[PDB]
Structure formats: structure tokens, C-alpha cells
């Protein structure tokens, strides 16, 4: 029986290894302020500000609050996530269970310049998860406020709030507005707790290894070909030079020639920059030189895009202009931070079947040859799919995004979350949470306006994630040894993925999942 | 002992003071004042020769 | 309802009273402060 003085749950984190399957469970400590007032707030930005047409919006703040724990180091460790990708082909999301409880609702009241804090035994809470899919869908568009990859901070709930279409900073009339108080939810007291479970679709399991052959060299190196191509187009050694016809086969010293059964993915080229400063133009063309999609009179930069390669062999220090996944180093500033406070992520390990970021698709042609005219060709920046096509996705990364909500619509192609990920179109529903308000004293004589005073109040709890994942072991006939994510070996001022004397814990660089092989 | 008496780990929950009523990323670093009392039993058999 | 229905009607109906919270306050000079009290009442009755 709940009571105040019994807690209703216990911590939870641990990893369970069990040969085909990886279990994970994580336990943190939340606090919940009250936002907005206890009000709903339309939020609107135009281009009557200095903002540009690019960038307006229209929307409602609400007063709620919403749990997300879409970041990997939600659940794995960095050791755990060693384990992971150092052994494993593939893996997948399966099922998981949440849970929320330990609540403690305090009441905060100020007089002059002194504050004291109290608990609030009979206050509530108000929890309610969307599972019918019916409001909008803001998780998967990599926002702050996950739970924090170290379990013994304590983090704040990120306040709810969506957009709808604009004009401007005008709203039109298929504008929808929202009430999450329309939706039934569960209250609770401090001895009350909450739990659901999630069954996740079927889905891919995500590819965390690099392939040991590139798409254009699947040909026995001893071999020739018993197919011809077009060699020669003019007689040579001679004085004077003719027209004619001459055909060979494909075979060792030229695998260029060499008939193919399959083509590289698809293209959108970006600009490439170097991370040495001196070999960049002088000049500010982050925006202006971008890579853009165009959608209702309205400019989006298109990142990071479709899934290129970083960069070519021995060429490192470049990177698209906004065609990667870049994180912060700890501490690192919001706005305009240097190049050592960013960590910057690499697609080096596509290669061998998507094309590099920079560099154009392809050669095609462009007139019709004549003896009069030579042939002409022109450079193909974009392209999109052809009969024949393989690719690869991004890849993952322990600080990345898990998954995304695949939009609702007539038809996708390859729905695979461009930042990285599982797609799903019937996501973990979102979990939506908020404390009711307390009114202060009400007025002696009636009056009809809703009452704007309150007690000052917040709360916190425990709540609990756990994961089942899939695992796809690796099957390997390779004779020498693979590439492993390993730690340092020399001696350092402190030990990377700890805290420091401060007690800060940091993440040192973006681990990804490609470290095994397999063959094309 | 290869497999001496386990060690005993206690700690109180940490509880927070007011947070911002605007989000923030960092962990909070404002907490309540708090400490703990009770009492503890231990118990053990001896063999005698 | 009302793009889609000839007519309407009410049938039947039931209500609800929870979370019962009683407070009190009490102000010292220019001071005013809020607590909860726990063994205070309310009355509620229908007139059927």
C-alpha cells in the first residue's frame, strides 16, 4: 500500500549481455518547474524584426513538459558501447518499458530577501503519454534536454511547444491549435507512480561495419572478360590519322573498361571546406555557397543531407560545408565556437559505394557527335535514382539520435532518417507531463475571470528506461586481424569518459559503429 | 576470504532547489541542504573449538 | 454536430469531485503566507 513515507520504486542501471540479445535500463533524477505561468502562448516570428523570410514561424508555447531519452548515451555506456561495436554486425530496437515515480512536489514561497522551500504532500502531478499519434511530433529533431549520458546528474524537462503553417508571421486557417488538456492523463501524489510498455515494428537492423571491397573492383583480378567495349575510334601511327572502329576486351590492366552490374547511390553535391584556414577562400560563404532545398518560396539548408562520403583517400582535413554531423565539445559556446571546441564526424567507410560529398556524380554527354562536330560532356552534380543503384546509410554514433517519426504521406523513399537512425512510423509515443496548478487565495466576492494567482511550485522524481535490442552476430572468414575502437595507452593529465577535478564529466570524441568488415 | 563479507554502499538522493522557469541544458548544481540518520544491525555466528 | 445531425438530445450524465485540498492563510503584518491543512472539511451534498 502507497504511502508518504514508502518509496514507490527502486533505482535501476545495469546491461545485460545474453548471446544474441542486450539488454539496457538507465535511472536518472528530473526536476519539473513551471512554465509559461501555467498558460498557453502564441509564439510568432516575422519579417517586420530583422529576420528574413527564411526563417519565420508561427506556433503555441505550452505549459507542459516532455521526457526524451532518444540519445544512445541514454542507454549505453561507453563501454558498453564498445562491447557493441566491436562484435557485432548489426542490431535493432525491440521493446522497452518506462517508468516514473519517487515524486516529490515543494512549494517555494519568498519574503523579502529570504527564500524557503517545503513539501507540498497533497499536490499532483499530471502524466500522459500520446500513443494514438494525435499531437504534433517534436521528438527527432535533435533537441537538448535527453536524459544526460552521465547517470548522476541531475537534469531539467525541456518545455513543449510545436509549430503549425504560417504566412509570415500571420497564421491561415488550416492553422491548428492545441490543448493538452483535452487528452486524459493520469495525477499523482508522492506515492504514486507510472509505467507503459512499447513493442517497436520491425525494422532494419542498422549496419555497423564497412565493407572490405569497393562497388567498381568485384572483378577475379586474373581474369579477362569475354565482353568488349569500344577502344578505339581513330587509326594511330600514321601520317595521317582516319576514322575506325576498334573493340577489346576487359580484363586485369584496365578495370576501368570492365563491364559492371551495378552503379554507385545517389548524389547532391556540397562544397568542400578545409580545416586548415589558409587554403579556404577569403570570404564568408557559409550561407551563400550552402547546399539548399527550396520549399514554399522558402530556403532550408539541406542538412547534413543524403549520405555521402566525407572525403577521399588522403584527403582528411576536408569536410562538406553542411554535410556532417558536428557536436560540441564540454563547455563549448552556443554561438559562433572555435574549431577545437567542436568535434567534427566522418563517412570516410562509405566509399566503396557512395560517392564523396565534393566531387560530381558522374560524366554524361551532351551533343550529338559529327565528323564536322567533336563530342561534348557535361558534369552531373545531382543525381537521382537509377536502375542499379546500392548504397549505404549514416552511420550511428553514441551521442547521436536513435530514431525518428516517418512523416505521414502519400509516398517516401528509402525512409531512413537523415540525421541517422531507426525510422518508424509508429514511433515511442511521446510522454508529456506537467504540474497542476495551486491557486492562492481567491477573493471573498465572486468574480468570473480565471484567477492569475498561485502557489510558486516544482517538482522532481526518479524515472526509469529500459531497452531490449537485437543483435546480429558477426560470421567471418577473414584471416588477419580487424580494426577495433580501443582507449589510449599513454599516460594522460585524466582519463577519457570521466569526470575531471571539477567533477565535469566529458565525452573526449563522436565514437561511430564501423569497425568490422564484410565483403560486397 | 576469496569472497569476503560484500561492502555496503549508502548515499543520500540528491534533491534539487527551484529550477529556472526557462530551459537549460546544464545539470543543475542547486540543491537542498539534507542529511540522514537511523540505525544498523550486523549479526554473526562464530564456530568454537 | 452541427454539419452532420437533424437533431440531439442529453440522456444521461455523471460528475465528479477529487483531489481535495484545504489551505490556510495567515498574515502577520505586511507578510502572507500559505499551508496546507490537513484534517480540515468540505460539505457537498445534491438536492435530488
Given at each position: 500500500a502507497d504511502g508518504v513515507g514508502s518509496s514507490s520504486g527502486n533505482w535501476h542501471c545495469d546491461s545485460t549481455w545474453l548471446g544474441d540479445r542486450v539488454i539496457t535500463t538507465s535511472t536518472r533524477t528530473w526536476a519539473l518547474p513551471t512554465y509559461n505561468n501555467h498558460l498557453y502562448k502564441q509564439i510568432s516570428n516575422g519579417?517586420?524584426?530583422?529576420?528574413?523570410?527564411?526563417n519565420t514561424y508561427f506556433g503555441y508555447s505550452t505549459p507542459w513538459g516532455y521526457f526524451d531519452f532518444n540519445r544512445f548515451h541514454c542507454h549505453f555506456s561507453p563501454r558498453d558501447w564498445q562491447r557493441l561495436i566491436n562484435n557485432n554486425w548489426g542490431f535493432r530496437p525491440k521493446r522497452l518499458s518506462f517508468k516514473l515515480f519517487n515524486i516529490q512536489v515543494k512549494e517555494v514561497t519568498q519574503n523579502e530577501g529570504t527564500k524557503t522551500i517545503a513539501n507540498n504532500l497533497t499536490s499532483t502531478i499530471q502524466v500522459f503519454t500520446d500513443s494514438e499519434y494525435q499531437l504534433p511530433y517534436v521528438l527527432g529533431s535533435a533537441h537538448q534536454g535527453c536524459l544526460p549520458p552521465f547517470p548522476a546528474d541531475v537534469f531539467m524537462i525541456p518545455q513543449y511547444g510545436y509549430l503549425t503553417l504560417n504566412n509570415g508571421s500571420q497564421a491561415v486557417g488550416r492553422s491548428s491549435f492545441y490543448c493538452l488538456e483535452y487528452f486524459p492523463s493520469q495525477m499523482l501524489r508522492t506515492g504514486n507512480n507510472f509505467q507503459f510498455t512499447y513493442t517497436f515494428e520491425d525494422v532494419p537492423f542498422h549496419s555497423s561495419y564497412a565493407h572490405s571491397?569497393?562497388?567498381?573492383?568485384?572483378?577475379?583480378?586474373l581474369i579477362d572478360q569475354y565482353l568488349y567495349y569500344l577502344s578505339r575510334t581513330q587509326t594511330t601511327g600514321g601520317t595521317a590519322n582516319t576514322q575506325t572502329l576498334g573493340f577489346s576486351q576487359g580484363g586485369p590492366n584496365t578495370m576501368a573498361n570492365q563491364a559492371k552490374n551495378w552503379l554507385p547511390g545517389p548524389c547532391y553535391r556540397q562544397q568542400r571546406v578545409s580545416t586548415?584556414?589558409?587554403?579556404?577562400?577569403?570570404?564568408?560563404?557559409a550561407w551563400t555557397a550552402g547546399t539548399k532545398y527550396h520549399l514554399n518560396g522558402r530556403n532550408s539548408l539541406?542538412?547534413?543531407?543524403?549520405?555521402?562520403?566525407?572525403?577521399?583517400?588522403?584527403?582528411?582535413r576536408f569536410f562538406p560545408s553542411n554535410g556532417i554531423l558536428i557536436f560540441g565539445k564540454q563547455?563549448?559556446?552556443?554561438?559562433?565556437?572555435?574549431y577545437s571546441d567542436v568535434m567534427l564526424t566522418s563517412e570516410e567507410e562509405i566509399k566503396t559505394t557512395n560517392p564523396v560529398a565534393t566531387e560530381e556524380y558522374g560524366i554524361v554527354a551532351d551533343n550529338l557527335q559529327q565528323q564536322n562536330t567533336a563530342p561534348q560532356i557535361g558534369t552531373v552534380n545531382s543525381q537521382g535514382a537509377l536502375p542499379g543503384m546500392v548504397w549505404q546509410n549514416r552511420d550511428v554514433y553514441l551521442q547521436g539520435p536513435i530514431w525518428a517519426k516517418i512523416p505521414h504521406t502519400d509516398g517516401n523513399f528509402h525512409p531512413s532518417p537523415l540525421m541517422g537512425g531507426f525510422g518508424l512510423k509508429h514511433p515511442p509515443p511521446q510522454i508529456l507531463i506537467k504540474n497542476t496548478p495551486v491557486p492562492a487565495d481567491p477573493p471573498t466576492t465572486f468574480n468570473q475571470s480565471k484567477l492569475n494567482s498561485f502557489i510558486t511550485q516544482y517538482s522532481t522524481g526518479q524515472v526509469s528506461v529500459e531497452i531490449e535490442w537485437e543483435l546480429q552476430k558477426e560470421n567471418s572468414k577473414r584471416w588477419n586481424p580487424e580494426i577495433q575502437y580501443t582507449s589510449n595507452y599513454y599516460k594522460s593529465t585524466s582519463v577519457d569518459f570521466a569526470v575531471n577535478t571539477e567533477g565535469v564529466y566529458s565525452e573526449p570524441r563522436p565514437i561511430g559503429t564501423r569497425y568490422l568488415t564484410r565483403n560486397l
Amino acid at each position: 500500500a502507497d504511502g508518504v513515507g514508502s518509496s514507490s520504486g527502486n533505482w535501476h542501471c545495469d546491461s545485460t549481455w545474453l548471446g544474441d540479445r542486450v539488454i539496457t535500463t538507465s535511472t536518472r533524477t528530473w526536476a519539473l518547474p513551471t512554465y509559461n505561468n501555467h498558460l498557453y502562448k502564441q509564439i510568432s516570428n516575422g519579417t517586420s524584426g530583422g529576420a528574413t523570410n527564411d526563417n519565420t514561424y508561427f506556433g503555441y508555447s505550452t505549459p507542459w513538459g516532455y521526457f526524451d531519452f532518444n540519445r544512445f548515451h541514454c542507454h549505453f555506456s561507453p563501454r558498453d558501447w564498445q562491447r557493441l561495436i566491436n562484435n557485432n554486425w548489426g542490431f535493432r530496437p525491440k521493446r522497452l518499458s518506462f517508468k516514473l515515480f519517487n515524486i516529490q512536489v515543494k512549494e517555494v514561497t519568498q519574503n523579502e530577501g529570504t527564500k524557503t522551500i517545503a513539501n507540498n504532500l497533497t499536490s499532483t502531478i499530471q502524466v500522459f503519454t500520446d500513443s494514438e499519434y494525435q499531437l504534433p511530433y517534436v521528438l527527432g529533431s535533435a533537441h537538448q534536454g535527453c536524459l544526460p549520458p552521465f547517470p548522476a546528474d541531475v537534469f531539467m524537462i525541456p518545455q513543449y511547444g510545436y509549430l503549425t503553417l504560417n504566412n509570415g508571421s500571420q497564421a491561415v486557417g488550416r492553422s491548428s491549435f492545441y490543448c493538452l488538456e483535452y487528452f486524459p492523463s493520469q495525477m499523482l501524489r508522492t506515492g504514486n507512480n507510472f509505467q507503459f510498455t512499447y513493442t517497436f515494428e520491425d525494422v532494419p537492423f542498422h549496419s555497423s561495419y564497412a565493407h572490405s571491397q569497393s562497388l567498381d573492383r568485384l572483378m577475379n583480378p586474373l581474369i579477362d572478360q569475354y565482353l568488349y567495349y569500344l577502344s578505339r575510334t581513330q587509326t594511330t601511327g600514321g601520317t595521317a590519322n582516319t576514322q575506325t572502329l576498334g573493340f577489346s576486351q576487359g580484363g586485369p590492366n584496365t578495370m576501368a573498361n570492365q563491364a559492371k552490374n551495378w552503379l554507385p547511390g545517389p548524389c547532391y553535391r556540397q562544397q568542400r571546406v578545409s580545416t586548415t584556414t589558409g587554403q579556404n577562400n577569403n570570404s564568408n560563404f557559409a550561407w551563400t555557397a550552402g547546399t539548399k532545398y527550396h520549399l514554399n518560396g522558402r530556403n532550408s539548408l539541406a542538412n547534413p543531407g543524403i549520405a555521402m562520403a566525407t572525403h577521399k583517400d588522403d584527403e582528411e582535413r576536408f569536410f562538406p560545408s553542411n554535410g556532417i554531423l558536428i557536436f560540441g565539445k564540454q563547455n563549448a559556446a552556443r554561438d559562433n565556437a572555435d574549431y577545437s571546441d567542436v568535434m567534427l564526424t566522418s563517412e570516410e567507410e562509405i566509399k566503396t559505394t557512395n560517392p564523396v560529398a565534393t566531387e560530381e556524380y558522374g560524366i554524361v554527354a551532351d551533343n550529338l557527335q559529327q565528323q564536322n562536330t567533336a563530342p561534348q560532356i557535361g558534369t552531373v552534380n545531382s543525381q537521382g535514382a537509377l536502375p542499379g543503384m546500392v548504397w549505404q546509410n549514416r552511420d550511428v554514433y553514441l551521442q547521436g539520435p536513435i530514431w525518428a517519426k516517418i512523416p505521414h504521406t502519400d509516398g517516401n523513399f528509402h525512409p531512413s532518417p537523415l540525421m541517422g537512425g531507426f525510422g518508424l512510423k509508429h514511433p515511442p509515443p511521446q510522454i508529456l507531463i506537467k504540474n497542476t496548478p495551486v491557486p492562492a487565495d481567491p477573493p471573498t466576492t465572486f468574480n468570473q475571470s480565471k484567477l492569475n494567482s498561485f502557489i510558486t511550485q516544482y517538482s522532481t522524481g526518479q524515472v526509469s528506461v529500459e531497452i531490449e535490442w537485437e543483435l546480429q552476430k558477426e560470421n567471418s572468414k577473414r584471416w588477419n586481424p580487424e580494426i577495433q575502437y580501443t582507449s589510449n595507452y599513454y599516460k594522460s593529465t585524466s582519463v577519457d569518459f570521466a569526470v575531471n577535478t571539477e567533477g565535469v564529466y566529458s565525452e573526449p570524441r563522436p565514437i561511430g559503429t564501423r569497425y568490422l568488415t564484410r565483403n560486397l
